[PDB]
RNA sequence: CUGUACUAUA
């Protein structure tokens, strides 16, 4: 037949009629409401879509709970698809939704229902402002509910939007973390190997490792390239932890004293396996010829404590020996390292820890090993017989004479 | 006389 051509009606005057409400703290149209902030029973979707007002409820809390209970599952349905354009026509509106208080909770439930066609918009959207969508304390948990969803070449697509960005700021922020250790936790290390090159710099490092918000991305991002182990006829991964581990290793020193990254120094040394070679370095390089000085530190005397925990025999022999025999006793005490650390607040820990280590490695399969330890637990359990008059009194010297007790030092 | 962090939106 004929063709005709249907152009659509100019309505310039919806939002200027949505912005009428009761309450100037909500932001449900009037003609919607029921007098008490919640909506009227006669509204119905198609209402919302024919007075063009899905903005106006997703800004409200009760507006919005009816969009996410109605909003139809299926990708098919008539009105899903119509309110799924009237919230990706505009960008600017999309956007304005994603880092709404209540709106976001709308925008992450049409991405639990979303097929290919719709994330590869919702995609393109949200990428031309990833990095403030990041930040924002609303938007984030957006990206994150993406990152989970999305295809895996999209959710590759939009985390590479964050590259060349200030990652210090988004990873030491209290909303952009979550959104990076997302990215680590679910994206294959080929979608954020610019991570591990912008935390190859020793400033990046400290700066976002030294923080209570970043030690937790530079933990989470050493357990996925760690948590490889076999399964791997080559390497990649393993040139990506030297890379980041190296760092770890330069400045471990400082990092093991911070009231933060002590817990990523800690996990270093007790993750064993394919951490287990930077473990032994950090104890050679840091803790060495520091153990007296660590073990009276709020912080690293935990760092001390899983030292002697995980080390091998091999470490835990020098360390021990420095401890026993590798300090000048105090010019008007008389007082050594052990003297010091029974009587210390934080040191008793460590030495509570000496015992225990002497006590699992008397069961070793190595005679010498198993005499070396002997040998160590007598020199504290003497040292401790003769300061047992004082240590009596205290809830940590009940402790470990309790440890010290009814032994075979073979 | 006992000693540290984050685990965030209606």
């Given at each position: 037949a004929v063709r005709l051509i249907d152009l659509e009606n100019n309505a310039s005057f919806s939002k200027s009629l949505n912005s009428t409400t009761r309450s100037h703290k909500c932001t449900l149209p009037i003609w919607a409401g029921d007098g008490e902030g919640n909506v009227s029973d006669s509204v119905t979707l198609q209402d919302v879509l024919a007075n063009d007002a899905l903005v106006e409820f997703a800004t409200d809390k009760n507006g919005c709970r009816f969009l996410q209970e109605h909003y139809p599952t299926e990708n098919d349905?008539?009105?899903?698809?119509?309110?799924?354009?009237?919230?990706?026509?505009?960008?600017?509106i999309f956007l304005s939704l994603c880092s709404n208080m209540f709106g976001n909770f709308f925008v992450q439930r049409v991405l639990e229902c979303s097929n290919t066609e719709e994330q590869e918009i919702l995609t393109e959207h949200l990428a031309t402002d990833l990095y403030n969508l990041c930040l924002d304390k609303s938007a984030c948990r957006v990206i994150q509910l993406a990152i989970q969803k999305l295809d895996v070449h999209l959710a590759t697509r939009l985390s590479l939007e964050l590259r060349d960005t200030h990652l210090v700021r988004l990873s030491i922020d209290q909303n952009g973390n979550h959104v990076i250790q997302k990215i680590v936790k679910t994206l294959p290390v080929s979608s954020w190997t610019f991570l591990v090159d912008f935390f190859a710099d020793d400033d990046n490092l400290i700066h976002v490792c030294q923080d209570k918000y970043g030690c937790r991305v530079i933990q989470s991002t050493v357990?996925?390239?760690?948590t490889d182990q076999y399964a791997q006829?080559?390497?990649?991964?393993?040139?990506?932890?030297?890379?980041?581990?190296?760092?770890?290793?330069?400045?471990?020193?400082?990092?093991?004293?911070?009231?933060?990254?002590?817990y990523v120094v800690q996990?270093?040394?007790?993750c064993g396996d394919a951490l287990a070679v930077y473990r032994d370095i950090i104890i050679e390089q840091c803790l060495l010829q520091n153990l007296l000085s660590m073990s009276q530190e709020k912080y690293a005397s935990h760092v001390v404590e899983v030292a002697f925990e995980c080390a091998p025999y091999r470490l835990v022999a020098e360390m021990m020996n420095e401890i026993f025999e590798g300090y000048i006793?105090?010019?008007?005490?008389?007082?050594?390292?052990?003297?010091i650390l029974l009587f210390h607040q934080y040191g008793n820990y460590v030495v509570q820890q000496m015992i225990q280590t002497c006590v699992l490695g008397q069961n070793a399969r190595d005679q010498k090993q198993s005499?070396?330890?002997?040998?160590?637990?007598?020199?504290?359990?003497?040292?401790v017989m003769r300061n047992a008059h004082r240590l009596e009194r205290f809830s940590s010297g009940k402790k470990i004479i309790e440890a010290l007790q009814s032994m075979s030092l073979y």
């Open positions: 349905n008539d009105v899903h698809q119509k309110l799924f354009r009237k919230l990706v026509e505009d960008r600017a357990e996925t390239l760690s006829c080559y390497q990649h991964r393993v040139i990506l932890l030297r890379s980041l581990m190296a760092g770890v290793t330069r400045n471990c020193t400082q990092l093991a004293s911070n009231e933060f990254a002590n996990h270093v040394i007790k006793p105090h010019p008007d005490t008389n007082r050594d390292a052990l003297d005499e070396m330890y002997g040998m160590w637990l007598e020199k504290i359990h003497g040292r």
